[PDB]
Amino acid sequence: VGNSSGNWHCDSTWMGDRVITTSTRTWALPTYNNHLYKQISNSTSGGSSNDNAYFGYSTPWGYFDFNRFHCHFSPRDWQRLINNNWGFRPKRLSFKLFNIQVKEVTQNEGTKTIANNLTSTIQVFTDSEYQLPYVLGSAHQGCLPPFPADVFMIPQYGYLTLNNGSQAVGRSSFYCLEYFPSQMLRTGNNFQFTYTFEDVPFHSSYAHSQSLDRLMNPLIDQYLYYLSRTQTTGGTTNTQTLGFSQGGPNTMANQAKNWLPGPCYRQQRVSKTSADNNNSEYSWTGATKYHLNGRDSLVNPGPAMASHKDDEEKFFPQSGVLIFGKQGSEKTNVDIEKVMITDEEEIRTTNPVATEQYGSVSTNLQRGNRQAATADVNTQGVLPGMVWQDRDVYLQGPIWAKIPHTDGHFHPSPLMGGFGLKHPPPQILIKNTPVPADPPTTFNQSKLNSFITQYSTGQVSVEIEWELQKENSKRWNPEIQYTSNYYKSTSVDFAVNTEGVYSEPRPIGTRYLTRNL
């Protein structure tokens, strides 16, 4: 009661090959659903179409979500990681919950009184067996804020199950979170928890300096021929023939290659200048969307592909990018100066542009009378010989995602970026233990529905150790570093304004340093 449970550690430590980023924050937990598990469906949320239909449950539990890069790295630390390392991956995590206070608010006569209840507890358990629906990795809100000065409130845990419209099917499951071994904590008690990440590939935080279709020696020809000429060129009567040429420094497009660009699933190309777009509502009609059990879902951000070709910054794939929102930006139909559209153009070297055909394939058998026809390949699954890069990471974006427990998954790297994990950091769930108001003086079999209004607060630390892969570039000229532009501004970037509101002006990725292909 009169002794702190922990201290405030919120700094990074660089040990050459690794970096340990600690981050403490203050949280607040209200009582959700008034301590009840309520069944929710698309009909309770005000009904919807069949594509938006759902069936799940709300629970009285809140959960901690530190699955974003800005909860761990400061804008400076991120820049020191982005400009010097070629890859990075997390090694171990260490979550701690302390300095717990369970305040009891009693609203009597318009006058609000908040007093601490020293004997009240909170339950907090971590599902280490992944027996509960994993909700993190869906890019939801409620993360430790990016700025350490502010306090956040803990999001409410709710899960979904199978549905047939707004109804439940036979296999729909109901999970009671009270059926797990929680750990009651009064003020004075603390919660410590450690976790060590499985072996996941380093995140390639570099761009390639060579294009996958220009990996030859521009001074030498090949010893391999290709159909160069099919028709004797002129006379007056040019006829059918067969001429073969050797690929050379002038026919780089016709040369023979060993590899192919990564897979594709074509996207619609919209312009940031609305005057260049067709005047129709194609936000849903012209979108690329997978079909699953009769209902359509937006492929967004979809698999990994370049945003635009050379010199076309104005164009972005309709769904193929991560769009973050500037500070304070609303929720609905916000305009384009209220969001920050990421630019995945550094992978145009290996991955095909999201808004263009993958290739062209012959669709018939040319003959004396039939001539050579060809089609455009919009969707192209992997093939032996393909090579591609994964989506970037974004200091504001997600860190990991749980690889779904299926018996088949190809290249389980999350489409939103990050590290795909089969055993991701577990979900730390926490709620305020109910404290009933004065019960009747005569026995009533009915469950007590009157409770003492309370909420808890306290601090939370999260230490993560990251393994780095230092850059050993033997390049001669200088590289492209991330730098704060030297020009004078009204307010510093990644700093608080004159009202104390912290804001991240732009989305920072990792691909700055270059490397050969």
Ligand X SMILES: CO[C@H]1O[C@H](COS(=O)(=O)O)[C@@H](O[C@@H]2O[C@@H](C(=O)O)[C@@H](O[C@H]3O[C@H](COS(=O)(=O)O)[C@@H](O[C@@H]4O[C@H](C(=O)O)[C@@H](O[C@H]5O[C@H](COS(=O)(=O)O)[C@@H](O)[C@H](O)[C@H]5NS(=O)(=O)O)[C@H](O)[C@H]4O)[C@H](OS(=O)(=O)O)[C@H]3NS(=O)(=O)O)[C@H](O)[C@H]2OS(=O)(=O)O)[C@H](O)[C@H]1NS(=O)(=O)O
Q: Does 490 bind a second copy (CB under 8 A)?
A: no
Instruction: Tell the smallest beta-carbon distance from residue 266 to a second copy (Å).
Output: 11
Instruction: Tell the smallest beta-carbon distance from residue 300 to a second copy (Å).
Output: 5
Which candidate, 360, 393, 392, places its Cα nearest to that of 375? Answer: 360
Task: Give the whole-angstrom CA distance, residue 321 versus residue 300.
Answer: 7
What separation in angstroms does the CA of 184 have from each of 120, 211, 433?
A: 9, 57, 8
Q: Which amino acid, residue 122?
A: I
Judging by DSSP bridges, how do beta strands 386-387 and 260-261 pair with one another? parallel
Interaction with a second copy in 369-428: which residues (CB under 8 A)? Answer: 381, 396, 401, 404-406, 408, 414-416, 420
Instruction: Tell the smallest beta-carbon distance from residue 266 to ligand X (Å).
Output: 23
Among residues 89, 91, 103, 186, the one that binds a second copy under rule CB under 8 A: 103
Q: Position of tokens 């400009």?
A: 83
For residue 370, the partner it binds in a second copy, ligand X, none, with Cβ less than 5 to 8 A by kind, is ligand X
Q: Does 405 bind ligand X (CB under 6 A)?
A: no
Q: Does 331 bind ligand X (CB under 6 A)?
A: no
Q: Does 220 bind a second copy (CB under 8 A)?
A: yes
For residue 411, the partner it binds in ligand X, a second copy, none, with Cβ less than 5 to 8 A by kind, is none
DSSP 187: B
Interaction with a second copy in 266-295: which residues (CB under 8 A)? Answer: 270, 272, 274-275, 277-284, 287, 290, 292-295
For residue 484, the partner it binds in a second copy, ligand X, none, with Cβ less than 5 to 8 A by kind, is none
Instruction: Tell the smallest beta-carbon distance from residue 272 to a second copy (Å).
Output: 7
For residue 34, the partner it binds in a second copy, ligand X, none, with Cβ less than 5 to 8 A by kind, is a second copy
Which token pair is 225? 């021929």
First-residue to last-residue Cα distance in the chain:
60
Other Cβ atoms less than 10 A from the Cβ of 400: the count is 19
For residue 277, the partner it binds in ligand X, a second copy, none, with Cβ less than 5 to 8 A by kind, is a second copy
Q: Does 365 bind ligand X (CB under 6 A)?
A: yes
Q: Position of tokens 């761009």?
A: 207
Interaction with a second copy in 190-209: which residues (CB under 8 A)? Answer: 208-209
Cα atoms in the 13 Å half-sphere on the side-chain side of 347? 27
Task: Give the whole-angstrom CA distance, residue 65 versus residue 95.
Answer: 11
Q: Which is nearer to ligand X, 36 or 361 (CB)?
A: 361
Q: Which is nearer to ligand X, 107 or 362 (CB)?
A: 362
Q: Which amino acid, residue 276?
A: D
For residue 365, the partner it binds in a second copy, ligand X, none, with Cβ less than 5 to 8 A by kind, is ligand X
Q: Which residues contact 162 (CB under 8 A, 6 or more apart)?
A: 55, 168, 169, 171, 172
Exposed / middle / buried, residue 478 (Cβ in 10 Å: 0-12, 13-18, 19+): exposed
- From 111-119, 326-334, 363-371, 491-499, span contacting ligand X (CB under 6 A): 363-371
For residue 6, the partner it binds in ligand X, a second copy, none, with Cβ less than 5 to 8 A by kind, is none
- From 285-293, 361-369, 469-477, 480-488, span contacting ligand X (CB under 6 A): 361-369
Which token pair is 397? 């974006």
Among residues 171, 291, 367, 488, the one that binds ligand X under rule CB under 6 A: 367
Which candidate, 100, 81, 99, places its Cα nearest to that of 90? Answer: 81
Task: Enumerate binding residues for ligand X (CB under 6 A).
Answer: 364-365, 367, 370
